[PDB]
Structure formats: C-alpha cells, structure tokens
Paper text:
Leucine rich repeat kinase 2 (LRRK2) is a large multidomain protein containing two catalytic domains, a kinase and a GTPase, as well as protein interactions domains, including a WD40 domain. LRRK2 is a large multidomain protein. Its N-terminal half contains armadillo, ankyrin, and leucine-rich repeats, while its C-terminal catalytic half contains GTPase (Ras of complex, or ROC), C-terminal of ROC (COR-A and COR-B), kinase, and WD40 domains. LRRK2 forms dimers at two interfaces: between its WD40 domains and between its COR-B domains; these interfaces are important for LRRK2 to form filaments on microtubules, which is enhanced by high expression levels of LRRK2, in the presence of LRRK2 type-I kinase inhibitors, and with overexpression of most PD variants of LRRK2 (3, 6, 7, 8). Here, we report the identification and characterization of the first high-affinity LRRK2-binding designed ankyrin-repeat protein (DARPin), named E11.
To do this, we prepared samples for analysis by cryo-EM by mixing LRRK2RCKW, GDP/Mg2+, a cofactor of LRRK2’s Ras-like GTPase domain (ROC) and DARPin E11. The resulting cryo-EM map and model showed that DARPin E11 bound to the LRRK2 WD40 domain. The binding interface between DARPin E11 and LRRK2RCKW is located on one of the faces of the WD40 domain, adjacent to its central cavity and opposite the kinase active site. Two insertions connecting neighboring blades of the WD40 ß-propeller (which contains seven blades) are particularly prominent in the binding interface: the helix-loop-helix motif connecting blades 4 and 5 (residues 2339–2351) and the partially disordered insertion connecting blades 5 and 6 (residues 2388–2414). The area of the binding interface, calculated using the proteins, interfaces, structures and assemblies (PISA) server, is 877 Å2, a value that is similar to what has been reported for other DARPin complexes. (i) The backbone carbonyls from LRRK2RCKW residues Gln2342, Leu2343, and Ser2345 form an interaction network with residue Arg25 from DARPin E11. (ii) Several DARPin E11 residues, including Val50, His54, Asp58, Asp79, Tyr81, and Leu88, form a deep pocket that accommodates the side chain of the LRRK2RCKW residue Tyr2346. Furthermore, Tyr81 and Tyr2346 show π-π stacking, highlighting the importance of residue Tyr2346 in DARPin E11 binding. The overlay with our LRRK2RCKW:E11 complex showed that the presence of DARPin E11 was incompatible with the formation of the WD40:WD40 dimer. Unexpectedly, we found that binding of DARPin E11 to LRRK2’s WD40 domain decreased preferred orientations on cryo-EM grids, allowing us to solve a cryo-EM structure with improved resolution.
Author numbering:
A (entry chain C): 16 to 36, 43 to 171
B (entry chain A): 1952 to 2015, 2051 to 2072, 2085 to 2158, 2166 to 2171, 2174 to 2184, 2186 to 2190, 2194 to 2250, 2263 to 2306, ...
The structure:
C-alpha cells in the first residue's frame, strides 16, 4: 500500500500511479519526498494534481525543494514553485533550498529561486548564509549572482 | 573498614578516579536525602563519611541555612578531587584544583566546584540538582577538554602530542597534551602519520589541495622534504597510502619517504575526477571506498573485490546515497559514512551486498543536524558515531543499540579517532577538543546498573 508506493516512487512507478478510486513511513518519507530524489517528472504531474502536500517535511526535515536542490534539478523546481512551495522552509539544520543549491553549485537553481522571491539572509545555528555555503565549497560563480542580488 | 581521613592521608594510590566518583555520588545521595526531609548539617566534612569497604564495583562504598550545606559539600568535593588540602574557608577565592594542587584534570567537576562555591547563598545549586549533574558518564570519564582560540577551525588531526591541521594558506598546529599549541599554499585537508622503527625516526606527512605532500619529523620541523604526488587534492593518508580526488591511489614503500620527491611504488587508478578516494582502513587486507563504490586490496597491491554502493540508493535518500565516502571502518561488517548523509549503512564483506542500515537521526531525535561526520571503531565491540551538529553517538555492534548520546559542548564535530595516551578518544569539533576514555560505553552500562541496584536498596530501606 503506502509502503509499496513510497518505495516504488524511488524506482519510478511511471504506469502504476496511485489508486484511481499522502501516507508517510516510519522514516517519514512521503511519496513526493521519495519521488523528488530520483528526479522523475511524471511524479509531480500525476501526484500534485491529486492533492499531495506541497510541504510535508520529514524527520530530518526536508521540504521537496530541499531535495530538489540536493539532487540537482530544473524541471522539479520549476514545477513545484508553480504550486507555491515555501522557498524559505528550513531544515532541522537550518538549510533553505537556496542553501543546498549554493552547496552543490547549481547556478540555474539559485537564479530560479531568487527571481521567485528567495531570501539571502537565511540563517542556521551555524550562522552561515548561502553565500558562505557557495564560497566554502569553492563555487564562487553562485556567490557572484548572490552578491549581485544582495 | 576505615574512615575518610586515612586514605586521604596515606592511601593515595588506591584512590582511583572511578572510586573518587563513588564517594561524592554516595555522599550527595545522603545530603539529598537529608535536605529532602528538612534537615541541616553545617559540619559536612571528610571526617563524617566513614567508608565501608573501598573498591569500585561495590553497591555501597561510603555513607554519612539550607543552602549553606551545599557550600560545605562543594568544599568536600574539592577536597575529594584534590587528594589533600588538609578565613579562606568561606572566602570564594581558593586556587583552582589542578592549577596549584597538581591533581589530574577532570572537567564537569572542576566546574561543579565553581558552580557550588559562589559567594551568594541564593543561586548555588540545590542538592537534588548537584547529585543529578554529578551522576553522569560524561562527567565521570571525560579525561581532558582542551579549547582552541577563535577562527582556528580545523578538519584533520592525528595522534602520536597531537598534530592539528588547520584561512586559504595551509598551516598546521602542533598540540601537546603544557597544553601550549603552535606550511603549504593550499589548506591541509587530510593528514596522517607513518613510523619507521628501523631508523628510530617518525615522518609526519600531510596532504594538500595542490597535492604537495610534505615530509617532516615529529622531533623537529627543520628537516623538511616533499613528495611528487600532486595532480589532485590529497584526501586521505594511511600507514604509506594516498587517496586523491580522481580516484587514483598511490602506494608508498616505508623507506621511500626520506628521499626527495619519491615516486610511488605503483599508481593505482579506481575511477574519474568525480569520484574521490578519501577513506582507507586496516582490517592484512586493506579496505576503502571511492565516489560511490568499495574495493579491497591484497598482498601484492591489486584490487580484488569492487562492490558498487550506489545500489544503496534503493534505500534511504538518493541525495545521501549518491555522495562521496567520508570514512570507512572495517569490522566483520563494513561501515561507511556518506558525505552530508545522516544515514550510515552496514556492508557485508563476504556476500558483497547490503546487510543493514543505521539511521543516525533516528537515534538523535530521542534526545542538532544528524548528518554523520566521522566513524570510529573501538577494539572488540563498541562503535562511535559523529554527527554534523554537536553530538557523539555510541553504538553496540552486538545489537546496534544506542548506549548514550554524548553531547559535545560545541556547535559541531569534525574528526575523531582512537588514541593511546591508558587508552583515550580524541573528539574534535567547532573549536574544542575533548578526550574521552575508551571504556565509555561499558562505563555507562556499569554506572547505570550500579545506580539501579543502589536505588533498589534505598527503596528497600
């Protein structure tokens, strides 16, 4: 049932879809969460229309924008802010999707979220901004656009 | 069998640390009872402890204004930690225990004395709170705790005096455990020691982002030489092995380090630039991982098995699984920690397939980031797990059950490994360095069992 759906979303159900008639797990993984890791596109076009929660964070604390900036994607983010996902949701370590984007050198993603109303003064308990995450990993290209939009 | 004057007078040797934290725990378990049923003492002294029979693993070892009693108990604890000391009594200006009396360092008691010795009879901790803080393994063992100045962040360290590897110019800091701490264009990412007992000299070698390996000795930093590995950022040294960022690994003969710019015995390549080799562990068969895949050595320095750990992504998050290996520790099962991953997996060295998972955040949420940083394996059966936040995890390989979530007094933890200083831990995190006794989990279990037994006995009486 729910376990099968959340495990298959990682592999990709494609055809199987879901009950033409948002269960969680002991690990807290929702179908959108498990789906945005593998980075499929049918997932958020056949499950968002059903009504799957745009923001259903995990025990780690992971909105499906943190995952989309984690794995590295364009279409998933472009789609998930169409529904209006919180661009300023915070991880349990205080990571915003922009933070994870600057952590993995995705210029496209920081450009996308910044035009959608993403902040640059987001904070964690370590007191690090996405500019700091970008420079620390050596991706000064993202830090350039962050400073330009600062 | 005696009173708490003779052993403080003559029997100084038998006053072991675990016995030292058995009297005060037992005294504060009587002072708490006294203040519970509205009594006062005003003469709490070592002369009124009168131990029964002194040896650590004992059910009972010693037993006897309201807030003026806590000051006397703090004085007693000071005279317990300092095995000696015979207007200054109520002064609040006594010397620090290890500063003048020369006792063995022991934090969380050297601080408890200060907390209970304040010259204000309104905010010194109540006896219940003082016993509550006193009974804790983090207090009992915690061999040392060294602190480092601001903006001296570090990410690599090695035992021997402890070498610390730290701006955009690589500088290393020699730390001695005294305690006065003290050379490349690129910062030193990883660092390790090699030993040559034949020539009674030890060469300490550090890896740099520019790849300029350094050869210096521990007795003096004058005789310096370099190797010629280069070609990437050295990410792991082990004793000599080198793990770069392109997956290449360079074995080195023990006696080649003295020669300037010595070539590796044989350059071994694993993968590409996107796959860095950053972990090497001792089992005589080496083990290690690069990018997302594990391998194995032999006696002739050739890969024998090569398992793909990308297949772990069928479980947990792909964002965690599709990451580089940080560290590997090889017991009968294989433990590898992924980059920025709060999930540690268990790999079977025989069937070459996954056999278990360890969820660090699942243990952490019962007591702050959860993302694993380092792994440490201790002797027969005790597993030490780091965490991105300020945390330390203890596991029991017999059943993979949590022992005690030790909370490091720092924002984060970076690197830890075993040491032989008496065997000790070396936990480092943002920057503070904490030294723990190897027997921490068995000590937790023993103290919990002894406290349960004593509580049962007290309930009986």
């Amino acid at each position: 049932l729910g376990k099968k759906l959340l495990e298959a979303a990682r592999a990709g159900q494609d055809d199987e879809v879901r009950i033409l008639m948002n269960a969680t797990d002991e690990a807290g993984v929702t179908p959108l969460h498990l789906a945005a890791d593998s980075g499929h596109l049918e997932i958020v076009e056949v499950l968002l229309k059903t009504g799957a929660d745009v923001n259903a964070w995990d025990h780690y604390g992971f909105t499906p924008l943190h995952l989309a900036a984690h794995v590295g994607h364009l279409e998933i983010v472009e789609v998930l802010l169409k529904a209006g996902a919180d661009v300023n949701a915070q991880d349990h370590a205080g990571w915003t999707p922009l933070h994870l984007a600057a952590l993995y050198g995705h210029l496209e993603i920081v450009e996308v979220l910044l035009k959608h109303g993403a902040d640059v003064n987001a904070q964690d308990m370590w007191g690090e901004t996405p500019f700091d995450l970008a420079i620390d990993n050596g991706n000064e290209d993202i830090a350039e656009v962050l400073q330009k939009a600062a | 069998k005696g009173s708490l004057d003779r052993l403080l007078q003559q029997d100084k040797a038998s006053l072991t640390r675990t016995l030292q934290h058995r009297i005060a725990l037992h005294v504060a378990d009587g002072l708490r009872y006294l203040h519970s049923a509205m009594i006062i003492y005003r003469d709490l002294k070592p002369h009124n402890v009168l131990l029964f029979t002194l040896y650590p693993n004992a059910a009972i070892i010693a037993k006897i204004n309201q807030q003026a009693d806590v000051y006397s108990f703090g004085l007693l604890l000071y005279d317990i930690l300092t095995t000696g000391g015979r207007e200054l009594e109520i002064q609040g200006k006594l010397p620090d225990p290890v500063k003048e009396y020369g006792c063995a360092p022991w934090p969380m008691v050297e601080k408890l004395i200060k907390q209970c010795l304040k010259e204000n009879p309104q905010e010194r901790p109540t006896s219940a709170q003082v016993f509550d803080i006193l009974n804790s393994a983090e207090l009992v063992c915690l061999t040392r705790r060294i602190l480092l100045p601001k903006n001296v962040i570090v990410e690599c360290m090695v035992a021997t005096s402890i070498w610390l590897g730290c701006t955009d110019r690589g500088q290393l800091s020699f730390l001695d455990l005294t305690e006065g701490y003290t050379v490349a264009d690129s910062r030193i990412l990883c660092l390790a020691l090699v030993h040559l007992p034949v020539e009674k000299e030890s060469w300490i070698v550090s890896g740099t982002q520019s790849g300029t390996l350094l050869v210096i000795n521990t007795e003096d930093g004058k005789k310096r030489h370099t190797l010629e590995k280069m070609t990437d950022s050295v990410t792991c040294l082990y004793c000599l092995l080198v793990g770069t960022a392109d997956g290449k690994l360079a074995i080195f003969e023990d006696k080649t380090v003295k020669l300037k710019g010595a070539a590796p015995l044989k350059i071994l390549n694993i993968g590409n630039v996107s796959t860095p080799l950053m972990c090497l562990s001792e089992s005589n068969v080496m083990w290690g991982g690069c990018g997302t895949k594990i391998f194995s050595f032999s006696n002739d320095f050739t890969i024998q098995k090569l398992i793909e750990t990308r297949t772990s992504q069928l479980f947990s998050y792909a964002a965690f699984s599709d990451s580089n290996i940080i560290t590997v520790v090889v017991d009968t099962a294989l433990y590898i920690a992924k980059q920025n991953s709060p999930v540690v997996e268990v790999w079977d060295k025989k069937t070459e397939k996954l056999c278990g998972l360890i969820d660090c955040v699942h243990f952490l949420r019962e007591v702050y980031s959860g993302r694993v940083k380092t792994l440490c394996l201790q002797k027969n059966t005790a597993l030490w797990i780091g965490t991105g936040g300020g945390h330390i995890l203890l596991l029991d390989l017999s059943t993979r059950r949590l022992i005690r979530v030790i909370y490091n007094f720092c924002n984060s933890v970076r690197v830890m490994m075993t040491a032989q200083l008496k065997n000790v831990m070396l936990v480092l995190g943002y920057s503070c360095l904490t030294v723990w006794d190897i027997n921490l989990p068995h000590e937790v279990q023993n103290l919990e069992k002894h406290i349960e037994v004593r509580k049962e006995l007290a309930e009986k009486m």
